Structure formats: structure tokens, C-alpha cells
Amino acid sequence: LSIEARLESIEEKLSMILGLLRTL
């Protein structure tokens, strides 16, 4: 995967993590 695609995936995982933490 390109660096750009990898960073996009990292951003998506961070969005998920943040969403889960906000429900606590």
C-alpha cells in the first residue's frame, strides 16, 4: 500500500477509536 493509502486507513481507525471512546 502507498503511504497515502496507509495514512488514510490510520485516520479511519482513529475516527473509530474516538467514536467508541465518546460513548463511554
Added chain:
Amino acid sequence: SLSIEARLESIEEKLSMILGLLRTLNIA
């Protein structure tokens, strides 16, 4: 087709929010 620097800026903002929220959750 976002630039790498713009993607890093978004990642950095999300990390900052995650850290602030986790510290808040850890308050006794």
C-alpha cells in the same frame, strides 16, 4: 486526493481529542 500534510493534520487532531478524552476517563 488529500495531501499527506492535510491527512497528518487530521490524524494529529484526532489523537489530541483521544488523549484528552482518555485522560478525562482516567480521572478518579
Added chain:
Amino acid sequence: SLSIEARLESIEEKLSMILGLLRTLN
């Protein structure tokens, strides 16, 4: 020191560990 790709690999593994802990919290 680390190449950009090696740093990304480390970041990706830490994210997997974080997500794994979130599903098993409490």
C-alpha cells in the same frame, strides 16, 4: 533512523492493540 514505512508499520500495530483493548474494556 526509521524509514517512513517502518514508522507506519509501528503505528499500525499500536492501532491494532488499541482497538483490541477497546472491545475488551470493562
Added chain:
Amino acid sequence: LSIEARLESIEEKLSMILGLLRTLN
């Protein structure tokens, strides 16, 4: 900051996040 320095800082923040999650559990 260079991209390499920004990624190093991101990695450090992720390590801190892991520590905070471990304490929370």
C-alpha cells in the same frame, strides 16, 4: 515539522494512549 518527525510524534501519542487505556481497564 518534517513528515518523519510528525510520524514519530504520532507513534509517541499512540504509546501514551495505550498506557491510558491499560490504566482505565
